[PDB]
Write a protein that binds this ligand. Structure first.
Ligand SMILES: Nc1ncnc2c1ncn2[C@@H]1O[C@H](COP(=O)(O)OP(=O)(O)O)[C@@H](O)[C@H]1O
Ligand SMILES: Nc1ncnc2c1ncn2[C@@H]1O[C@H](COP(=O)(O)OP(=O)(O)O)[C@@H](O)[C@H]1O
Ligand SMILES: Nc1ncnc2c1ncn2[C@@H]1O[C@H](COP(=O)(O)OP(=O)(O)O)[C@@H](O)[C@H]1O
Ligand SMILES: [Mg+2]
Ligand SMILES: [Mg+2]
Ligand SMILES: [Mg+2]
Lengths: 230, 372, 371, 184
């Protein structure tokens, strides 16, 4: 329209505008005058906290995203643990590529993507991956920006999966919603394999349904440990 | 030869240690901290959490969650993190060669006890474990057999009466008003003087203010009038960033919610009325013995005005021909743990453990037939 | 005898006459004092400025906000705002007119007492009353039951109300409102290459906000559309004739209300605080709360905010619930409008605190009257 | 008209109506509700107390008290409110021209019956009133003369045996365990 923004012209105009508005002289001055009736009725020490024992920091996650993705694509036998926690600026197609590559990988048993700003496409892709992959044991998607729809799709993948034992989904940026929570526990009652589900429920109903489902699955573990004892 | 472990997992704090001692070895807050969603600090290459003192020290970039709400374990993975931290990082011990004693509040879900047994036997696998009621341990630490225990912690406040070793479960009372509610009320009422504490890191600051400066008034209206008259009840507190705040009547308005729950919108009665109702629901021939043996336990009973106020209120409610005695020992914050150390040291208790063979044979349901 | 209605907010004073359909005077809440660019505070020259004058000579005037997050904290500067409001904006003699004031949710007792004391002792008004903002909004809406979302320039509150009895324990306050949204819009325009960091440019930024911003129904879809095409962009003509083009800033800016991490602040969004507020209220009355979500205040004026709120509450609540969002077009001054309906009633005459009642009872009467 | 009134004030519900009918006209819960929160909207037909169905409908902002506990009237002002409601608001009748029949559980205190008589004759003044045992009425409705009645309501559970119209008071049993205890 008018080309590149000329900030100096705007500032000059604004200052010109300000110069031309002088104040008015119709102000009744504030003197603090009381015109109504005044009503008449008829060792210190600053304890500072010091519980913060400064346990040291760690070392930033040195994983090479490209190299690791290449190893997962190559089905590298030496690669069992993939930890992509707290790595800055991982593209959404890169995470989707990770999820696509993990479908046929025979060797990665733990996968986590905490605090990588992952959203619903990533969760959808991971959901698709979980229907096919038969080796992955641990999935941690905590502390991201995945909505209720992504989580729903994830748990809708669970009856086509018999290998995952831990799903951590807690501390998403938005509450999942009561309706979604109901469909989630409903799906949890239709899988006998998952042993830990990381999520702070809001409603006591699904909370207890989930608790009973997990106790049931662990008791199936107990009973098969008892039956195989000759 | 194998030393027994005593672990008390309350709503707010974990007190863990070895049986036969006098004080718990590890006392740390029962919180799990997770990364903040603000992308300020991404360089910390951790796993996915911080637990305990480490979470409290790094709270400026963390979101803090309590795994237990109102005495009920709501998240079990975070509870596993707490137990792993208190076994391997704090006590510096290997769980497979030490029996474990755990505690539970009355009128809790059965599933909580079942899953505690299941987690202790299948993930942190112990030779034996035993679950006990907290008020029985408080009475064990108090040295007597008959009494009514008011146990108030971070999530629950419960009254349990016991006469000659027999408990009366129909007179057990439970009120969902404890230290965390008082912390929230203090956060709400500090906005009247212009101080704004909102984030969970400032909740710990408000909790420290409550632990250091609050007390229970003997008469609420007289102390309010005294505070309104002169600035003799005002105390100063220094914030972590060097700011200095002054508080007056908020010192005693905060614990007064324990006697007037309607300050936070609850329809229930105060702790004195609840204690009197628990006494009146028992048999007539034991009430006299309950009157002389009011036992206070828990960290919420540590305000320096609460025994005299409770005695005044209960003496007002009870008949005038009765001796009302409040028993408030100085070490009552860790009475449950002390009782657990007493219980785990008895020679007559060693046949009441639940071994791994029994758990394998019976499953996670023997905890009702073996533990009270 | 005509009553006055003064609605003092964090950003704007709205003042006028009871019975009118809109406030006659609307002006910012900014006390402006001489700076030290040259010499000290000159004696005899006007020692303070309010509203438009303070928003004009801004460059040499330290600007203050006497009301901070809805609570009166500088009583001298409050009394100043009030004096200027009576004498220099409405142009009335206060002693001839009953004056209705508004207050924030959970306003401390001592503030109500001090407000009462100032109204009777300084300005010698014949009568006054103090009504709670959110309650006035629900009154104006024509209902006796609902949960108000009141969001202005400095503070947002959720106030649940049932059959005339508000619920103090369930009120939620969030310190995120219009001024934060202006700051955020300024930041992301600077990011795009339009560096509006002067106090002069601030007005322009506010105008862009009020004219071109909207709440997207599905944010990430909208972001993809804005990245894939120019179909959502708008031109804006600046006061000097320059024309700029803005894109996704239109809907990134009010998204902060739903996602406060955009400005750092780790609090829940207004949909989450709304839900949490409802969940602190007893099981029985909850259903009614869901059916009467009333939006009040200027920061609820963004197009599309009702549909977005409907979606978030719908997905956050049990399916069986009838969810309804009520967003009157006149909600920008609805509080004032509520006051206009309030004083105009034949039944309101005996509700005022009179001067004689104050002279007999003292500060006490404000609580010991209509609570 | 002189058409007698029949009112049954149990621990949980009030069943009131006119004699000669088949079903009670007004069946409403025996509760009194009082507000516990702060009122901010003036007028709007706000009451300082609520009785019956109105208290049950608005129970989310009220504290509900039962005037009768285990068949014994513990609060008398609330009982006067219940009786005023069931005479003037529900049955829509004037009490001074209708005899009243009231019920009482066995083995109750005498003071309860005395104060019921005093209130019915000095505040809602009736030409006549009569107090009857509930189990005798239950046997009356069953159509027979001999039987043992187990009457269990909201506050009491009592057994009364009657043979050929003669009652045996030494075999009347009373247990303070009923619906409210099961609710608790
Ligand atoms: N000196 C004190 N005064 C008042 N309250 C205290 C004090 N010390 C601790 N508390 C409170 O006690 C609570 C926990 O006490 P305790 O019962 O020992 O832990 P838990 O509830 O986890 O079993 C904390 O929430 C804390 O606020
Ligand atoms: N059309 C609009 N779009 C977006 N924001 C608006 C619009 N109109 C007004 N606002 C914002 O609302 C604020 C006015 O709210 P106000 O009525 O003063 O609330 P209160 O006084 O209760 O805080 C202004 O600061 C402005 O930033
Ligand atoms: N269908 C039902 N099943 C079980 N209990 C019921 C049923 N209907 C009513 N009740 C119980 O009956 C009690 C009151 O019954 P009733 O004897 O008619 O009233 P009252 O005890 O006041 O005379 C109530 O406490 C209620 O819990
Ligand atoms: Mg405890
Ligand atoms: Mg306003
Ligand atoms: Mg009956």
């Amino acid at each position: 329209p008018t080309g590149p923004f000329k900030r100096e012209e705007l500032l000059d105009h604004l200052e010109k505008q300000a110069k031309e508005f002088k104040d008015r002289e119709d102000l009744v001055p504030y003197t603090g005058e009381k015109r109504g009736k005044v009503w008449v009725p008829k060792l210190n020490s600053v304890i500072k906290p010091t519980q913060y024992k400064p346990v040291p920091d760690e070392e930033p996650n040195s994983t090479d995203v490209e190299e690791t993705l290449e190893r997962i694509k190559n089905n590298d036998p030496k690669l069992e643990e993939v930890n992509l926690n707290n790595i800055r600026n991982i593209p959404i197609p890169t995470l989707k590529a990770y999820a696509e590559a993990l479908k046929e990988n025979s060797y990665v048993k733990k996968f986590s993507i905490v605090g990588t700003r992952s959203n619903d496409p990533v969760a959808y892709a991971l959901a698709e991956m979980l229907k096919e992959n038969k080796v992955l044991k641990t999935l941690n998607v905590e502390s991201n920006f995945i909505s209720g729809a992504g989580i729903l799709r994830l748990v809708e993948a669970l009856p086509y999966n018999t290998s995952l034992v831990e799903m951590k989904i807690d501390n998403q940026s938005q509450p999942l919603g009561n309706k979604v929570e109901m469909e989630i526990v409903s799906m949890l009652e239709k899988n006998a394999t998952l042993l830990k589900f990381g999520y702070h429920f809001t409603q006591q109903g699904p909370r207890l349904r989930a608790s009973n489902a997990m106790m049931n699955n662990n008791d199936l573990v107990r009973k098969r440990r008892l039956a195989d004892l000759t | 030869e194998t030393t027994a472990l005593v672990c008390d997992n309350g709503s707010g704090l974990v007190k863990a240690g070895f049986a036969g001692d006098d004080a718990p070895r590890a006392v740390f807050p029962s919180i799990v901290g997770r990364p903040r969603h603000q992308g300020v600090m991404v360089g910390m290459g951790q796993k996915d959490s911080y637990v305990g003192d480490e979470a409290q020290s790094k709270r400026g970039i963390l979101t803090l969650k309590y795994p237990i709400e109102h005495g009920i374990i709501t998240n079990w993975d975070d509870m596993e993190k707490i137990w792993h931290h208190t076994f391997y990082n704090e006590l510096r011990v290997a769980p497979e060669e030490h029996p474990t004693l755990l505690t539970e509040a009355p009128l809790n879900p059965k599933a909580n006890r079942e899953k505690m047994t299941q987690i202790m036997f299948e993930t942190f696998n112990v030779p034996a474990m035993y679950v006990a009621i907290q008020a029985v341990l408080s009475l064990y630490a108090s040295g007597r057999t008959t009494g009514i225990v008011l146990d108030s912690g971070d999530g629950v406040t419960h009254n349990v009466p016991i006469y000659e070793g027999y408990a009366l479960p129909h007179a057990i009372m439970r009120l969902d008003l404890a230290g965390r509610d008082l912390t929230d009320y203090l956060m709400k009422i500090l906005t009247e003087r212009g101080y704004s504490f909102v984030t969970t890191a400032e909740r710990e600051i408000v909790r420290d203010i409550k632990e250091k400066l609050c007390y229970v008034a003997l008469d609420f209206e007289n102390e309010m009038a005294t505070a309104a008259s002169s600035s003799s009840l005002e105390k100063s507190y220094e914030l972590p960033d060097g700011q200095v705040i002054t508080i007056g009547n908020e010192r005693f308005r905060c614990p007064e919610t324990l006697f007037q729950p309607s300050f936070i919108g609850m329809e229930s009665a105060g702790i004195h009325e609840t204690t009197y109702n628990s006494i009146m629901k028992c048999d007539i021939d034991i009430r006299k013995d309950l009157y002389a043996n009011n036992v206070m336990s828990g960290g919420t009973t540590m305000y320096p005005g609460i025994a005299d106020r409770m005695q005044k209120e209960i003496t007002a409610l009870a008949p005038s021909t009765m001796k009302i005695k409040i028993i408030a020992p100085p070490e009552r914050k860790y009475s449950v743990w002390i009782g657990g150390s007493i219980l785990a040291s008895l020679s007559t208790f060693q046949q009441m453990w639940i071994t791994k063979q029994e758990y394998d044979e019976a499953g996670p349901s023997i905890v009702h037939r073996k533990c009270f």
